[PDB]
Amino acid sequence: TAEHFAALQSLLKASSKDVVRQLCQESFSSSALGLKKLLDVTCSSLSVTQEEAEELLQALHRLTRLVAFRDLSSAEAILALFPENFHQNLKNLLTKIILEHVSTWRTEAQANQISLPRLVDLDWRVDIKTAVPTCLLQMKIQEDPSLCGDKPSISAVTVELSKETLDTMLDGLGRIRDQLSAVASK
Template sequence: MTSPPTSHVNMAAGLSSEDFTNLQLLLKAPSKDAVRDVCVQSYRAPSRRLAESTAATFSIPAAEAAQLIQSLHTLSHHILFYNLTSPEQILAVFPESFHSNLKNLITKILLENSSAWRTEALSHQVSLPQLKELDWRVDLVTGSDSVSRMALPTCLVQLKIEDPCPSAGGESISTVTVELSRESLDTILDGLGRIRDQLSVVAGK
């Protein structure tokens, strides 16, 4: 099973029936612009200030406004996390019983903003260390505390890794050397082969 891509966007929690019940509160909005405003603003971390202003605009209790904003936040991150980029994909997220016009309006707003949200998420994502160079050699163990290990071949793999976000005072380039037995190397090669096959499947879609 192919895993969805990762990014700075948090892994979207599964949308629940309660979320869609909360989204129905958008029907109390005084205008489509009010719906658009709260949808866009809720993408970022929900705040009490946003809940209070939404409660005043929609004429609903602050607690309900906070639930609405949280559900909108979850929905927008769900759309980004699963890379839903077409109206059909987003509409399919909603239950069949969901208000038709409201569903279409939310979908339109999400599509209008998802590209900018995705760019923002990518620009703020924390980059993982990247492999820059790899070197290796095969040695023969000629002395060991364990007689059984004597005269056994071993592989030394040297990895040069670049950390885009090194700690204060730390080097951006570091070198790691690992010793692998034939059995360990076979296990790693099998795992890398599986990763290569999965990447090929994803790239082919």
């Protein structure tokens, strides 16, 4: 929107190329509802108001998220977003900084994309019971903080595999690695 483009010009008050660079990185990575924590220090950066600074950070956040979303990998495709009457040297600076991060930003989002609960660590032990062997399969699961509640994000599961059930599991892990070959046959 026009309000976003008006806000981005506030970067012309910046003190270094890195200040623009760091604000781009931070505006992408903090969540849309979460940007607020830097507002005063951002205000002191550029000497802007808090209300201007929130719209600035939202403008960068929308711009960087949209660029990451479409995987815009040429300057003309990024430059085409900007109006004819928009400061050329600023848009060149923003375009460069975008191309410096778009691979990184797109990867960062793919690391935090939604899923079922994610394995984060794994351990195992073999142990002879009163005699017969058993495996104590120990997994750490990481659930999304938004959704586990006030429970911890990281929860540990521990499973007894017997020799018989371990064979049934490896038969399943077998078929998976086989299925992972037969794709697009015939």
